Design an enzyme around this catalytic site. Structure first.
Site, short mmCIF file in Angstrom:
data_model
loop_
_atom_site.label_atom_id
_atom_site.label_comp_id
_atom_site.label_asym_id
_atom_site.label_seq_id
_atom_site.Cartn_x
_atom_site.Cartn_y
_atom_site.Cartn_z
NE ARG A 1 50.67 10.38 32.24
CZ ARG A 1 50.44 11.59 32.74
NH1 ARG A 1 50.63 12.67 31.99
NH2 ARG A 1 50.02 11.72 33.99
CB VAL A 2 56.67 9.27 25.17
CG1 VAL A 2 57.60 8.51 24.28
CG2 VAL A 2 55.28 9.28 24.60
N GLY A 3 58.84 9.47 27.24
CA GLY A 3 60.12 9.38 27.90
C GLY A 3 61.28 9.05 26.98
#
Lengths: 140, 143, 40, 183, 272, 140, 180
Positions: A1-3
């Site tokens: 979810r950070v990426g």
């Protein structure tokens, strides 16, 4: 979810391509048992996906640095492994690492310090890759 | 349409021409070679071997060579409304002369003569003689 | 569907490789005479 | 149950797995307590392949190139890769048929079937079920035979030959006998 | 239960995937087969029309020979069903008058269709023809086999390939030497035969047989591939429907398992 | 798990072959139903498996002695039921039983006592089966 | 969460369906209260469209032709029909290629891509990230634009023009300026 926020740009530049390429391979996977009957524009995806999948393989208790990762993935995404047999890629990478670790430590230091893959360093990288391919010989 | 010659030169694996308008077309009949043009009568003929020679209406002088092994030719009169007379050259193997070789031809001739030296069956002798014919034709026809 | 496919697969493979084994048994002793007891 | 600096205990535990469900809490907890694992299957025993060991669920901490050399490690991993490839082709074979498979896939299927039949062997205590005598296969012979089968040397040999044979030489003897009985 | 429904869902998902893949493969093969037709039909039409100028009556009495073209693989829709239906119709119509019927076939499907009912009439069957690409050499063999067993009247049943989603079953009353000798061939007097007619007729007739078989088999192959694509489409759709139903059942069984286990634990907790 | 140890030798000799044949028949039964060309050996396997399956059927409250089972399974294993119609076997059994209870009681007594099949009893049983097939007629 | 005579409270609840089981008691009890639905998808954001609202999966109880009049309903159902037809045409083109298409099929494809691109729009808040300004859009303008695009009057306009434009007039201006 950070990426990609948890990535250096040198890794973004190749990962944004490889993710799409592997997704395309995942869309045409079942055709691997029928690729003899298909046409181009669909065998290239299978070939690139297979090459990348054989590239991402790794050995136990043998990790690598981000610079070497960037160099190897540049060799991979830029089509310097499509015409090779897959089984030989595990050799290729290894030799290439030693090659660069023998010859172009400056490129690795620059990628580690600046955290970027500029056009000049990219040209240096293509030069080193061409020299490596010229020195060695592979199956296909 | 037009008062040309509608050629269709067809093999099983590839149709080289379908409705090609030409002026004259030479074909190696079983009796002898002959050139079909517009106005030629309806006819059927058996071919033995040799070099079909096509000449388009636009070409006149320029030609196209095609080696044929065996097959048939069917010349059919022109319909009153079409104004054009048709011809169909069916060949079991229609090669161009560019794709021919004189060395493999002689090698196959030698192997045929070797196989037919033990002449016991009528079909073996006949095949040897007909192979000699076709291979000599290929040699004379190749460039 | 499960037992159906499984048994169909097993039968098809069995038949195919039975034929292939029959042919290999025919053509074995010629190409590997060192095993042929006729020459021993 | 563990080795110390005074002695060593080598244990061998048979774990009942009810209803062939490995997700049960008892075997699920027992898996974490073991160095070597060997999972037996019914789908394999139905094929008469005894011992009915599933080589894709069996594992071992020892199978590493530093403990057992690469000649062993690579051989084992190639065997496992071949068997997984044969397992992925099962549905294509069941729906379409062997006619659709390429010659590479047919070679794969043949080698995988030969490996499956070759891993079988007869025990001395199972004489009262099969009647056949027992075998003791040393490990170098096993590695030689597996390398030979994977390399493609034994493609000519029939699949039936690799049944309850201690070594590849026995397989050759059985193939010779079957070919002689064919004529 | 749960393991049952999960296994069924897994199997059906695999079926759907393989079906879509085979659909694309059959589309490619249909492209190549249409190319084969477009290249190889002109080779066959002219001589067929030339000899069809001689009208053949299908009511003639004599030893009939029925050549039924079919496939060797399954999942071809129902084209071979219609072929065998037409063949049964023809046989039952011509065997009443007393014509002794013989049956030649191409493919194992016609063999499996007619073994039990008309297996006492087979003469020669060929198969494994669709492995390699169809060629004139494959047809000349069958034509020679037909000529060596020269019957009095020959029929050919196959499937015409109208379009990618439409075929049509046909029966070709084919001329034979017995039917040719019984005609003076006055219809061909308009044609100048370069060798004499009596000398070239037997060769024109052998060519006619070969071309007939060639074109008929090409059309049958194309129709087969079209039906294969349609069947794969329908199978994938049905698999999706079955997947939906099995998903509903799986969720129901999952909820039931959770509730049952929890009620067991609670009842064991309150009985203390 | 006990297996052959709880079995008579006369029944071992037949039941081993029967179990093997039934395994093969179960293996190829599904493929056979679809309908495809098969080799003579495969067809023979199907015929023998179908014969044995039709042999193992029994009426309720109609058990049989061990020697009669031995004789019937001998008739089934040595190939005296392959050409015969499956649906006919249900009487081939019954009649054969009556025949060997009428004129060949000595074979049954010998099998009951010695509990094995010597070559003499083998030949006698074969001759009895030949006489039975001669005296009677079935659909194949 | 309801309307009264003084004011109202609207609510936008995010839902998580456990194990894709819409029959589970939690969402089954929650969907009873929902008066609408707004699905997002990464398969539309990859096309650059933002907001990535899947126009087909989305539903609503207010779309009936009593609260919105019998022109909104007609336009919406027409657009849904068009997009379903384009989905089928895409499934076909994946196999038979885009050469075996009739003229009406290519018209349907063009209108479908044009309306799928058109529904995207910028946001006033994303300006600080991009500099591109915000576009508020009233509903009658959208209805007229969809009517025109579906009638086939706007087929001439290029597909690229129908991107990140608040109104049809802006699309025309972009097409006018892209010819240069």
């Amino acid at each position: 979810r950070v990426g990609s926020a948890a990535q250096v740009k040198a890794m973004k530049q190749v990962a944004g391509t490889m993710k799409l390429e592997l997704a395309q391979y995942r869309e045409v996977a079942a055709f691997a048992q029928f690729g003899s009957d298909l046409d181009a524009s669909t065998r290239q995806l299978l070939t690139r996906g297979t090459a990348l999948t054989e590239l991402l393989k790794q050995r136990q208790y043998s990790p690598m640095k981000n610079s070497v990762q960037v160099c190897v993935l540049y060799c991979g995404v830029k089509g310097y492994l499509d015409p090779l047999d897959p089984k030989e890629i595990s050799r290729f990478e290894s030799l290439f690492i030693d090659y660069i670790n023998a010859n172009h430590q400056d490129i690795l230091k620059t990628i580690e310090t600046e955290k970027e893959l500029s056009e000049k360093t990219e040209a240096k990288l293509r030069a080193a890759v061409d020299e490596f391919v010229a020195m060695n010989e592979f199956k296909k | 349409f037009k008062n040309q010659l509608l050629l269709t030169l067809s093999s099983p694996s590839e149709a080289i021409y379908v409705r090609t308008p030409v002026r004259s077309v030479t074909v190696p009949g079983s009796e002898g070679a002959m050139t079909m043009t517009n106005g030629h009568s309806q006819t059927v003929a058996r071919l033995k071997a040799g070099e079909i020679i096509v000449r388009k209406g636009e070409t006149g002088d320029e030609v196209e060579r095609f080696f044929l092994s065996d097959g048939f030719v069917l010349f059919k009169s022109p319909e009153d409304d079409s104004g054009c007379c048709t011809a169909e050259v069916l060949g079991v193997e229609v090669v161009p002369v560019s794709m021919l070789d004189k060395e493999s031809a002689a090698t196959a001739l030698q192997e045929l003569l070797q196989q037919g030296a033990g002449a016991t069956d009528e079909w073996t002798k006949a095949r040897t003689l007909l192979g000699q014919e076709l291979l000599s034709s290929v040699i004379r026809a190749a460039p | 569907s499960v037992k159906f496919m499984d048994q169909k697969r097993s039968g098809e493979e069995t038949v195919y490789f039975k034929k292939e084994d029959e042919a290999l048994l025919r053509n074995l002793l010629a190409n590997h005479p060192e095993y042929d007891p006729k020459y021993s | 149950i563990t080795t110390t600096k005074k002695g060593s205990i080598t244990s061998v535990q048979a774990v009942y797995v009810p209803a062939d469900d490995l997700t049960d809490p008892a075997p699920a907890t027992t898996f974490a307590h073991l160095d070597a694992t060997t999972v037996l299957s019914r789908q394999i025993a139905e094929l008469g392949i005894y011992p009915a060991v599933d080589p894709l669920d069996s594992t071992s901490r020892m199978l590493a190139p530093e403990i057992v050399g690469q000649e062993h490690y690579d051989t084992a991993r190639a065997t496992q890769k071949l068997l997984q490839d044969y397992k992925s082709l099962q549905d294509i074979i069941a729906i379409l048929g062997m006619d659709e498979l390429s010659e590479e896939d047919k070679l794969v299927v043949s080698r995988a079937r030969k490996i499956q039949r070759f891993l079988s062997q007869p025990f001395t205590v199972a004489e009262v079920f099969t009647g056949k005598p027992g075998r003791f296969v040393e490990l170098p012979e096993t590695i030689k035979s597996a390398q030979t089968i994977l390399r493609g040397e034994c493609d000519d040999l029939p699949e039936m030959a690799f049944y309850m044979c201690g070594g590849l030489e026995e397989v050759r003897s059985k193939a010779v006998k079957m070919a002689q009985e064919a004529a | 239960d749960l393991k049952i429904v999960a296994a069924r869902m897994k199997s059906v998902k695999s079926i759907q995937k393989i079906t879509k893949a085979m659909k694309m493969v059959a589309a490619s093969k249909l492209r190549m087969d249409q190319r084969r037709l477009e290249n190889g039909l002109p080779f066959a039409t002219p001589v067929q029309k030339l000899v069809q100028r001689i009208p053949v009556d299908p009511k003639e009495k004599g030893t009939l020979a029925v050549l039924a073209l079919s496939s060797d693989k399954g999942l071809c829709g129902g084209v071979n069903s219609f072929v065998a239906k037409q063949a049964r119709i023809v046989i039952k119509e011509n065997e009443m008058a007393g014509n002794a019927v013989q049956v030649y076939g191409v493919g194992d499907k016609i063999r499996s269709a007619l073994q039990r009912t008309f297996g006492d009439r087979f003469k020669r069957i060929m198969t494994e023809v669709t492995r390699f690409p169809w060629n004139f050499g494959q047809a000349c063999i069958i034509a020679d086999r037909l000529m060596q067993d020269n019957p009095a009247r020959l029929m050919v049943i196959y499937n015409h390939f109208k379009s990618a989603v439409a075929y049509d079953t046909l029966t070709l009353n084919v001329l034979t030497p017995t039917q040719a000798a019984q005609s003076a061939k006055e219809q061909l007097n308009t044609f100048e035969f370069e060798p004499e007619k009596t000398d070239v007729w037997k060769d024109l007739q052998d060519f006619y047989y070969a071309c007939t078989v060639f074109g008929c088999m090409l059309d049958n192959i194309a129709s087969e591939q079209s039906a294969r694509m349609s069947a794969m489409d329908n199978a994938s759709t049905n698999a999706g429907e079955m997947i939906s139903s099995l998903t509903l059942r799986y969720n129901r069984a999952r909820q039931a398992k959770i509730t049952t286990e929890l009620v067991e634990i609670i009842s064991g907790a309150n009985a203390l």
